[PDB]
């Protein structure tokens, strides 16, 4: 199962060579009859588990809205906005596609029940389908670890049992592809760890490794985690490289940068694929893209995006501002006052196009001359429809209150009876951000960008993302302030208009939206609503109750049946009973190594402790920086670090059989036999709260162990027999 | 020799004499408060009229800026001001001379540190005019600042730190617990100053943990040694270091005594023992009936008792009683008796004095509502009921009884009745069962963004939230001295509640504000005065002859560390001798890690960093350099040739920061022109100093 340690004498102390034999490599493969028809036996058990009564939760299930809807957004081609990367949505819309979905459920809120015309079952099929593929891949990865066959066995099938996987893949949702790729990302190192690290196995299981570890960072973003975990490895492994004497200075450069290629070049290219399939099957314009630029709509197809308006502005031309910064944005002004200050008409940010979006430029002091907006021209942006100019008097501001900063500004006045220098306006074109030419001295539409400076008290004109409550509801607001963000300071200017023009005038329009802004722009939305998804969720959890299995989430609740993820706990508090007496051993044997005593003696033991602390750094990886996190966070973020917890307890129990039982193997099975049979019973009793199948009261009562996880437990009838003469509500 | 005891005698004292010169040259010319010496000046100010304040620093240097006022004849009565003159009776000319020399000692404090560690000699007057000509230090050395006492301490720390060192092969020497008990006030005094100071104790402590874990190897050391061992370090490198820090806070809460602003970052109990106390009455405590109280939280967050006017959207359409932090007459509040009883009249006789473990009915004195919980939950917290007000003297139910119970008395009078500050109690209702709590969450905006208030069935006797306490009495005593380890947690609890309110937010553009990876680079610098042609005009950058080559220098060892690292595990040989080895880890090693300690919670954290931050991590990374200059010439020691361009290129560097810092010498002495004379040294963009 696993050689000795070959060490070698180096010049000053002894070193451990890193190249395998082929004979490592034979010994942790299906080389037999009996391991395949092992890995067929776990097939069918896995397949039968993880894809059992399908289908009976015929309606949508946590975030099954979420995903499901815009995989039916991109069936539609209707562009919309998630935290995610694209490839597991757009890949069960390829699913949904190859399954006859044309859009047309929008998968609102959990509970609807599914008409006859979506394929679901086989939207359910494909995620169940790899969250059953990822047991066998934890099999082959265990093996690859190096790892008695049984053990492996019973391991995996004690994978297959875990209640978590389970819920989490058989529902439309976003781990069940993203835990299959970080599982072959994991299959595919280990795969290339028993390679002598030359040869053309070792370079595809690289090349494995980059298109898994590739697109599990391209389905979710925990897969970059997976991402750095891989690369620690390599540190791991280039270390001990390093390590190697018999290995030549330029085969370490060789692993090194075909290692960094694979493993970086490969995740790149295949997440910029993915954008591009992303941006290039989204192409049609509906609400979703109504946080993102002009710039960025200008791709889509069916724009409301103002396209030739004209370039040159002059002195005496309707005009309609749009705020660069936040998305939101048009000075809007109409007939509402205000609740507090001076209770005057009010200017806000409404992001859609009106005829109260529109402004004149006119003179402090109409003729018949154009004379151009210079920089540094003031003028008093005049409201066409309310009669009113812009005025910024130093009252109190309307939500942002607090602020000796940011001066709060109006719309009030008379033309021609009403016109004071406190509406007065300072063009000052930032030349930096507008783009050079002509538009860098004077004023064009779409392409210079301004920043008002009011003439009378030196604040600049200004808005952030905090809406108004009060009056003209979800409108942002607009302020003149001093010592504001540069870059939430900057205006432009879009659909201009003026009598003293020609209708031969040079027209001007976007630049739409190169691959590389189109990438950037999309993740900067990403990270932006990643930070800011702050929303009060009552199965929202912390990441510091995640490995004692407490108050896990929960998942649909129709027709006296419920569904529930909590974790095989016989497995969980096993997997982190090992954290915390693995953690203990390798700081005694540290204390141990170094106060005089022996460590590492066996290759076995030695063997376990370096996958531990491969698999452990996989935990630790995928784990720790959810503490790092100023967001939201339910019990299934902690599941792709319990993936690498269930190896490291994979390896526990090979060493509970392999080592510490060596003259007696029939308790180390016996061990592992009571333990997969615990778990398996765990599975049993918990079988009905994962598929949604009937339970009892009473024993649903009798079920939850801790008091903390509580799943509607009253939804339940008396009695199992009342399921079968019982109809069954649809939403 | 004999010439290496010249230059050891006269070199220290030349190096003195231009840190004398450097940080003192026109001290008193600005006539003007300038950067941050508006706000530690006045800091200062509060302990010469023993006034309390708070703020988020340590005590100990702003105690030294007060000792730097009682030297200057200064009696504290004028607060500073930013940018205005001073009056003639404050000499800030003796302040700035104070700070200023503890720059001015900073220097060759940086001479001795270079001769401990290795270095030999024209390294040490490499590191000696590198620290000493340098425009970052002399610019900020200038002025009444806790930056120079927190560089101070950091090169006495890693001054001590080495010199420690130097003496592990004798232990328990005299020299041993010399510059270990030194190590251990220098620390004490690095934190004590500010609070950043912690990142010299993550380095010294780095450097404890291996040494214990090397000494766990050695054969010969028994386990006596081993054990007096951790006992020496944990006394001279924890204790003594906590000792300066709790002495610091002793004469901080024994040395003020008076009422200031801020004092309303306390506990009321604290804050009545001093002598201001607009928080306490002399002779009675609290009655019943006429006893007209506002009842304040004892909990971190908790605020006085509150009722307004408008009432439950969600409830039993009765009063909102909730928890609001200000002054009002909507806080007042008094005592009636229980259900079954007659209620309180105005024309009484007997002023009964209240009684514990008795039923009560908490009427509030402006409304005339009884304090009540009803049979609707809380808002948020779904798991309990909601407080509330209802009816009159006469009109309720069985759960207005409310029973009062003593938790803590504070002596000085009779401990058996309730009293006004000396009795934290708890609230029970009478028929339900639950203890009057506060959860401290914020409630939505029906009312008006105020505290929630709970009645928790079984909360515990050791909770904070449940402690309430009387403030105000209103119808020959003092108030016992308070716990003062518990003041010392309460005033670094506020201090650090100031740290997470010192967190900006990103729509607002402080001019002033940096990133930390613009202090190395020199992106930006600092402007910390008025840019009139009236005053001359000072301006934080370090000289980018000794920063740029410095930064470089901490790239160019950071990747030595990991090349030597490599070659180790490749079974090089690469430090031979101990003399090499003990110039790479205590003169390149812990400078990289005390570099990094000083420098990486600066780009991690999320708080407003300014130029002045780098200062002590700037100072390890001229060691650094100065380490870059040792061991990267060494070998040019044996080759005439090598040995003349070795010293050439010490002088070429030498000459190098020697002219760049006289090139820059106007943005620390003074730039008394109209601000644009000074354009020839506006280099970069982002340098805003012309
Ligand atoms: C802690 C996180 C660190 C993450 C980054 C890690 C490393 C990157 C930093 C530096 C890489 C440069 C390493 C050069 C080592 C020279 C040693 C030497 O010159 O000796 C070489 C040894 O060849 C090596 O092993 C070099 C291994 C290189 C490791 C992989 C390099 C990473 C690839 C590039 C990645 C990006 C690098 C830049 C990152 C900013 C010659 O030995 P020999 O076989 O000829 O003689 C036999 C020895 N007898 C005589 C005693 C027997
Ligand atoms: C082991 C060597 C292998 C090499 C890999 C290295 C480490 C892998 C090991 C663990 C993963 C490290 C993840 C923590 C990193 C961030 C630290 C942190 O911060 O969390 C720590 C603690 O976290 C943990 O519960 C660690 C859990 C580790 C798994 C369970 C360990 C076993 C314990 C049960 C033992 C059962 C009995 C045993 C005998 C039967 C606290 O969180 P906090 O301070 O942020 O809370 C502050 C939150 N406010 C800001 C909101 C207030
Ligand atoms: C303008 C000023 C800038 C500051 C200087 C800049 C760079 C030079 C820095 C360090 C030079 C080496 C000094 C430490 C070496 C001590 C160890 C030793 O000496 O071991 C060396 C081997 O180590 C090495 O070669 C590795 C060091 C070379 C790597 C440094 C370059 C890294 C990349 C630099 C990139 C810089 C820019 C990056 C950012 C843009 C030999 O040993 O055996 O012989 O031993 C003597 C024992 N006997 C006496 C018995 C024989
Ligand atoms: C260089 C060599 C010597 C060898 C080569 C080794 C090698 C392959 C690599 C060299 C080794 C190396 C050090 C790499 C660094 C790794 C690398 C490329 C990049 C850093 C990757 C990172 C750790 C961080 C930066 C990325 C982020 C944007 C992270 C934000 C995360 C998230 C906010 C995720 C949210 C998703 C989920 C948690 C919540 C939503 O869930 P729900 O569905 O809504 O409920
Ligand atoms: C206004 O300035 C621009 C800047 O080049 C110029 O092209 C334009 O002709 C000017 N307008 C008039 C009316 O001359
Ligand atoms: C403090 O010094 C000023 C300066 O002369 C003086 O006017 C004032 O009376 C002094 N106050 C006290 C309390 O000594």
């Not at chain 1, 459920?105 to 939207?123: A, H, K, Q, R």
């Not at chain 1, 008409?345 to 002091?365: I, V």
């Not at chain 1, 529930?564 to 005694?588: H, K, P, R, S």
């Not at chain 2, 503890?102 to 000696?128: H, Q, R």
């Amino acid at each position: 199962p696993v050689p000795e340690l070959d060490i070698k004498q180096g010049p000053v102390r002894p070193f451990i060579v890193t190249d395998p034999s082929a004979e490592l490599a034979s010994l942790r493969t299906m080389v037999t009859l009996k391991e395949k028809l092992l890995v067929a036996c776990l097939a069918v058990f896995t397949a039968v588990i993880r894809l059992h009564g399908l289908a009976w939760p015929d309606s949508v299930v946590f975030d099954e809205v979420h995903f499901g809807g815009f995989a039916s957004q991109y069936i539609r081609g209707t562009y919309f906005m998630d935290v995610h990367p694209p490839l597991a949505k757009m890949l069960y819309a390829g699913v949904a596609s190859l399954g006859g979905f044309q859009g047309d459920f929008d998968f609102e809120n959990i509970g609807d029940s599914f008409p006859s015309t979506t394929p679901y079952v086989l939207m359910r099929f494909f995620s169940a389908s790899l969250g059953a593929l990822t047991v066998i891949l934890m099999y082959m990865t265990l093996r690859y670890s190096g790892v008695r066959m049984w053990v492996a066995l019973m391991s995996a099938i004690c994978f297959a049992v875990e209640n978590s996987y389970v819920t989490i893949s058989r529902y439309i949702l976003l781990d069940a592809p993203l835990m299959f790729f970080i599982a072959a990302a994991v299959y595919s190192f280990k795969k290339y760890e028993m390679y002598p690290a030359n040869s053309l196995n070792a370079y595809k299981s690289l090349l494995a490794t980059g298109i898994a570890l590739g697109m599990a960072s391209s389905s979710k973003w925990v897969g970059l985690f997976t991402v750095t975990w891989v690369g620690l490895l390599c540190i791991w492994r280039l270390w001990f490289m390093i390590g190697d004497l018999t290995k030549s200075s330029k085969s370490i450069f060789k692993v090194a940068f075909a290692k960094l290629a694979f493993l970086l070049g490969v995740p790149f290219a295949l997440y910029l694929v993915f954008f591009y399939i992303h941006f290039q099957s989204l192409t049609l314009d509906g609400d979703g893209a109504s946080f993102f630029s002009p710039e960025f709509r200008s791709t889509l197809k069916n724009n409301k995006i103002p396209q030739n308006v004209v370039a040159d502005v002059g002195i005496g031309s309707i005009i309609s501002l749009r705020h660069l910064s936040t998305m939101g944005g048009y000075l809007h002004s109409h007939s509402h006052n205000y609740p507090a200050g001076s209770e005057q008409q009010q200017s806000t940010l409404y992001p859609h196009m009106d005829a109260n979006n529109d402004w004149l430029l006119e003179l402090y002091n109409s003729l018949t001359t154009f004379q151009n907006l210079t920089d540094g021209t003031k003028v008093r942006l005049f409201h066409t429809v309310t009669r009113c100019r812009l005025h910024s008097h130093d009252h109190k501001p309307p939500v942002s209150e607090s602020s000796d900063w940011q001066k709060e500004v109006s719309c009030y006045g008379y033309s021609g009876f009403d016109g004071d220098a406190n509406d007065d306006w300072v063009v000052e074109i930032d030349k930096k951000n507008s783009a050079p030419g002509v538009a860098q001295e004077r004023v064009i539409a779409l392409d210079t960008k301004f920043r008002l400076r009011h003439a009378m008290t030196g604040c600049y004109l200004f808005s952030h993302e905090v809406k108004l409550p009060a009056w003209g509801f979800e409108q942002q607001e607009v302020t003149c302030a001093s010592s504001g963000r540069h870059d939430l300071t900057l205006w432009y200017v879009e659909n201009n208009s003026n009598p003293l023009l020609p209708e031969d005038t040079k027209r001007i329009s976007y630049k739409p939206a190169s691959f590389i802004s189109k990438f950037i722009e999309s993740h900067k939305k990403m990270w932006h609503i990643n930070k800011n998804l702050v929303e009060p969720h009552v199965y929202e959890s912390q990441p510091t109750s995640w490995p004692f299995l407490l108050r896990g989430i929960s998942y649909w609740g129709e027709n006296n049946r419920n569904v529930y993820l909590l974790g095989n706990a016989i497995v969980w508090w096993a997997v982190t009973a090992f954290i915390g007496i693995f953690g203990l051993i390798v700081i005694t044997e540290l204390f141990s190594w170094q106060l005089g005593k022996p460590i590492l003696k066996d290759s076995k033991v030695v063997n376990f402790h370096v996958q531990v602390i491969h698999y452990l750094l996989g935990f630790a990886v995928h784990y720790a920086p959810s503490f790092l996190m100023q967001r939201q966070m339910f019990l299934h973020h902690y599941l792709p670090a319990y993936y690498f917890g269930i190896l490291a307890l994979g390896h526990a129990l090979d060493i509970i059989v392999s080592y510490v039982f060596r003259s007696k193997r029939q308790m180390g099975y016996a061990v592992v036999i009571t333990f997969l049979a615990a778990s398996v019973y765990f599975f049993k009793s918990f079988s009905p709260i994962i598929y949604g199948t009937p339970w009892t009261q009473e024993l649903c009562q009798k079920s939850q162990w801790l008091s903390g996880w509580d799943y509607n437990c009253n939804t339940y009838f008396s009695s199992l027999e009342e399921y079968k003469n019982q109809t069954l509500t649809k939403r | 020799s004999s010439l290496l005891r010249l230059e050891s005698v006269v070199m220290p004292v030349i190096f003195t004499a231009l840190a004398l010169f450097t940080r003192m040259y026109k001290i008193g010319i600005n006539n003007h408060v300038v950067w941050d010496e508006a706000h530690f000046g006045k800091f200062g100010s509060y302990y010469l009229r023993h006034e309390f304040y708070h703020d988020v620093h340590p005590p100990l240097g702003k105690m030294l800026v007060g000792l730097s006022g009682y030297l200057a004849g200064y009696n504290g009565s004028w607060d500073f001001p930013s940018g205005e003159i001073y009056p003639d009776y404050l000499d800030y000319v003796k302040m700035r001379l104070f700070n200023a020399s503890f720059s001015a000692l900073c220097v060759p404090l940086a001479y001795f540190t270079a001769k401990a560690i290795g270095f030999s000699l024209p390294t040490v007057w490499l590191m000696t005019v590198l620290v000493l000509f340098e425009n970052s230090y002399s610019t900020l050395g200038r002025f009444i600042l806790l930056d120079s006492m927190l560089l101070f301490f950091t090169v006495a720390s890693f001054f001590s730190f080495v010199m420690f060192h130097n003496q592990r092969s004798k232990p328990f020497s005299r020299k041993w617990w010399k510059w270990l008990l030194i190590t251990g006030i220098s620390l004490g005094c690095t934190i004590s100053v500010k609070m950043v100071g912690l990142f010299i104790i993550t380095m010294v402590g780095i450097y404890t943990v291996i040494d214990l874990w090397t000494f766990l190897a050695d054969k010969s050391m028994s386990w006596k040694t081993y054990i007096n061992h951790w006992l020496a370090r944990i006394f001279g490198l924890i204790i003594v270091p906590f000792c300066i820090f709790l002495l610091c806070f002793k004469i901080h809460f024994d040395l003020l005594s008076h009422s200031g602003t801020g004092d309303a970052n306390m506990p009321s109990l604290f804050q009545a023992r001093l002598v201001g106390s607009d928080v306490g009455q002399g002779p009675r405590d609290i009655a019943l009936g006429s006893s007209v109280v506002s009842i304040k939280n004892q909990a971190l967050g908790g605020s006085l008792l509150h009722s307004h006017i408008q009432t439950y959207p969600d409830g039993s359409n009765q009063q909102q009683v909730t928890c609001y932090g200000y002054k009002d007459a909507n806080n007042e509040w008094f005592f009636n008796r229980e259900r079954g009883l007659p209620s309180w009249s105005e024309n009484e006789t007997d002023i009964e004095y209240l009684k514990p473990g008795t039923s009560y009915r908490l009427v509030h004195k402006s409304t005339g509502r009884n304090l009540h919980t009803h049979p609707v939950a809380a808002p948020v917290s779904k798991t309990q009921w909601e407080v509330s007000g209802y009816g009159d003297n006469v009109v309720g139910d069985n759960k207005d009884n409310w029973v009062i119970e003593i938790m803590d008395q504070r002596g000085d009078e009779d401990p058996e009745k309730l009293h006004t500050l000396t009795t934290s109690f708890r609230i029970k209702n009478l028929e339900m069962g639950c203890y009057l709590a506060q959860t401290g969450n914020s409630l939505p905006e029906w009312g008006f963004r105020q505290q929630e208030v709970v009645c928790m069935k079984n909360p515990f006797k050791r909770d904070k939230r449940t402690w309430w306490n009387i403030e105000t009495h209103e119808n020959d005593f003092q108030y016992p001295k308070t716990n003062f380890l518990k003041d010392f947690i309460h005033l670094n609890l506020a201090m650090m509640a100031t740290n997470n309110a010192l967190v900006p937010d990103p729509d607002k553009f402080d001019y002033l504000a940096s990133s930390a990876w613009q202090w190395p680079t020199l992106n930006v610098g600092l402007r910390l005065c008025g840019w009139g042609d009236d005053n001359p005009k000072y301006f934080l950058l370090g000289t980018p002859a000794s920063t740029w080559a410095s930064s470089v220098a901490v790239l160019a060892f950071m990747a030595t560390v990991v090349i030597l690292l490599i070659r180790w595990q490749r079974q090089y040989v690469d430090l031979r001798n101990p003399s090499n080895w003990n110039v790479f880890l205590m003169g390149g090693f812990y400078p990289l890690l005390a570099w990094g300690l000083h420098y990486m919670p600066f780009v991690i954290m999320s708080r407003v960093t300014y130029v002045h931050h780098y200062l002590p991590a700037l100072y390890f990374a001229l060691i650094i350099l100065a380490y870059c200059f040792d061991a990267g010439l060494q070998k040019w020691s044996r080759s005439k040739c090598g040995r003349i361009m070795r010293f050439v290129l010490y002088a070429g560097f030498m000459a190098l920061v020697i002219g760049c810092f006289w090139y820059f010498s106007p943005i620390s002495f003074g730039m008394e022109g109209p601000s644009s004379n000074f354009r020839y040294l506006n280099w970069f963009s982002t340098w805003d100093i012309a």
